[PDB]
């Protein structure tokens, strides 16, 4: 599990735990560190990686990476707004209507290639073939990198299904 030179993390004192530990004494906000591989993502079109926040045309980054740890368990990690900008780490790649920006979409693809390798290609391959996108993960080797996540419960009883995780302090280089 040798991490890519292509992903740098912010200076932090958090130590390495596992996704198994995260899921298995109260439910307050937590801050974890993981050594991880991307196994899936949402949404399936990179064209939809930025959404409209404020009309008429103000967009923000919003997507999720399904990540997998040494302990063979997955976690959906949300990259939103400034944290997603941190990851993308590119002046020329900005939130907008991506369908209207083919060149920038290609640039996004190329940048995200550095964190998930041929995952996107394979996911799209399966969609066109009429097969499940989850097949893609086992087709390819995706790179390893350290990731920071902030655990929290947004306002949408109160169970674990109600927790969300958000990536941060992680940049593609």
């Amino acid at each position: 599990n040798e991490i890519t030179a292509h992903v740098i993390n912010e200076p932090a004192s958090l130590k390495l735990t596992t996704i198994s530990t995260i899921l298995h004494n109260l439910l307050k906000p937590r801050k974890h560190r993981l050594r991880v591989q991307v196994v899936d993502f949402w949404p399936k079109s990179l064209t939809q990686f930025a959404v409209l926040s404020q009309p008429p045309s103000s967009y923000v980054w919003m997507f999720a990476l399904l990540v997998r740890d040494v302990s063979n368990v997955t976690l959906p990690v949300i990259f939103f707004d400034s944290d997603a900008a941190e990851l993308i780490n590119s002046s020329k790649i900005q939130p907008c209507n991506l369908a209207d920006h083919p060149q920038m979409t290609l640039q996004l693809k190329e940048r995200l290639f550095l964190i998930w390798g041929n995952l996107e290609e394979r996911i799209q391959h399966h969609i066109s073939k009429g097969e499940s996108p989850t097949l893609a993960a086992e087709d390819v080797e995706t790179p390893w990198f350290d990731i920071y996540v902030k655990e929290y419960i947004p306002v949408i009883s109160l169970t674990f299904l109600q927790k969300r995780w958000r990536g941060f302090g992680t940049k593609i280089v």
Partner: peptide
């Protein structure tokens, strides 16, 4: 596990409440 975020995702879910944000910010 079949996670919700792998089918649907909204801006609601991405917003960290101000109180929880403060806890994370201080511990940093």
């Amino acid at each position: 596990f079949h996670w919700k975020n792998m089918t649907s995702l909204s801006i609601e879910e991405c917003i960290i409440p101000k109180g929880q944000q403060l806890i994370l910010e201080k511990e940093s």
